[PDB]
Ligand binder design. Structure first.
Ligand SMILES: Nc1ncnc2c1ncn2[C@H]1C[C@H](O)[C@@H](COP(=O)(O)CP(=O)(O)OP(=O)(O)O)O1
Ligand SMILES: [Cl-]
Ligand SMILES: [Mg+2]
Ligand SMILES: [Mn+2]
Ligand code: NA
Ligand code: NA
Length: 315
DNA sequence: CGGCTGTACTG
DNA sequence: GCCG
DNA sequence: TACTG
DNA sequence: CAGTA
């Protein structure tokens, strides 16, 4: 962690991101990670250009920060940016929505609350604005997972319940709880949610689909905060690909999916497929065929990769 | 030049 | 923004 | 119980 | 969270 040139660069990345330049923001993201994991502080332009993810433009910015301790770009960042960031931290509102609100003269959450027309998701996002920005301690994630497990167990179906996401990767704090539920390959979802809602445990629903639920829960007692809860239900046949997907991290999933693509394969939460047919844009023409993947290890093996424990997937 | 993951949900 |  | 899928 | 040992 030997490079606080990244603190200035992170400012630019978020600015680009909220203003909608997604790929330039991606470029900075990668450059920032590269510098974060570099063993030593970077003193050199040729040393800088040695790092994958750091090109001439990035290198020029490294040299400028070393020379002046400042970044000329940061000073010229649009004054709309802090407001765009405030708005896009509302769950359900992204860059397009934040920009529209800003164009329309909104400047604070008070403005949004009184004059803005919110979708149902954004209204819930706004009501829990601060809570959605907080991470919980690992132990509280445990209690939430166990609450879902007990509800699932009570149906005496074949339900298996596993906590994924950052929890399964062993993190000390969690932004939400991501729970995977599997049923024998042979309405279960809706009954379960009804159980959790009857207990007073589920307090708001953001998304309810056939495959995924995203919502808000709160444990009993004083000093409790509303916490985000994601639940996915998949057939047992898809277990390993679903566990791999939901375990992440997002960056890890993207790298592994990118590798699969170079191999003429495709990886999603449903399956690993081979002999996939893609056009000149890398867009899928035809689906190829599904490879058997009984465990996570099989996916790595079929990709020609060494296994990584969830702890080693946090990227 | 042009990709940078691949899916689900909403209205 | 970077890189193939 | 400690771990996998 | 059911199964494995
Ligand atoms: N953009 C993306 N592309 C592909 N896969 C993605 C993804 N975003 C999330 N995922 C997958 C992996 C996450 O670990 C998992 C949960 O996504 P998440 O939004 O809960 C982030 P997590 O890794 O759990 O950390 P935390 O902040 O919640 O504590 O879903
Ligand atoms: Cl997916
Ligand atoms: Mg999570
Ligand atoms: Mn989540
Ligand atoms: Na480089
Ligand atoms: Na948002």
């Amino acid at each position: 962690h030997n490079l606080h040139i990244t603190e200035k660069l992170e400012v630019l990345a978020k600015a680009y991101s909220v203003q909608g330049d997604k790929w330039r923001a991606l470029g900075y993201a990668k450059a920032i990670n590269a510098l974060k994991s570099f063993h030593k502080p970077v003193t050199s332009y040729q040393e800088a250009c040695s790092i994958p993810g750091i090109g001439k433009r990035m290198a020029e910015k490294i040299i400028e920060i070393l020379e002046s301790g400042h970044l000329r770009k940061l000073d010229h960042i649009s004054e709309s940016v802090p407001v765009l960031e405030l708005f896009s931290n509302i769950w359900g509102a992204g860059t397009k929505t934040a920009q529209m609100w800003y164009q329309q003269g909104f400047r604070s959450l008070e403005d949004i609350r009184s004059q803005a027309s919110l979708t149902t998701q954004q209204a819930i996002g706004l009501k829990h604005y601060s809570d959605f920005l907080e991470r919980m301690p690992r132990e509280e994630a445990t209690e939430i997972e166990q609450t879902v497990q007990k509800a699932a167990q009570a149906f005496n179906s074949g339900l298996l319940c596993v906590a994924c996401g950052s929890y399964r990767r062993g993190k000390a704090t969690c932004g939400d709880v991501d729970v995977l539920i599997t049923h024998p390959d042979g309405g279960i979802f809706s009954r379960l949610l009804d159980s959790l809602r009857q207990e007073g445990f589920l307090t708001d629903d953001l998304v309810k689909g056939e495959t995924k639920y995203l919502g808000v829960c709160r444990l009993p007692g004083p000093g409790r905060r509303h916490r985000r809860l994601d639940i996915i239900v998949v057939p047992y046949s898809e277990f390993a690909c679903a566990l791999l997907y939901f375990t992440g991290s997002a960056h890890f999933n993207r790298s592994m999916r990118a590798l699969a693509k170079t191999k003429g394969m495709s990886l999603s939460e449903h399956a690993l497929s081979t002999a996939v047919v893609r056009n000149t844009h890398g867009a899928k023409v035809g689906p190829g065929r599904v490879l058997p993947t009984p465990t996570e290890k099989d996916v790595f093996r079929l990709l020609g990769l060494p296994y990584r424990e969830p702890a080693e997937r946090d990227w």
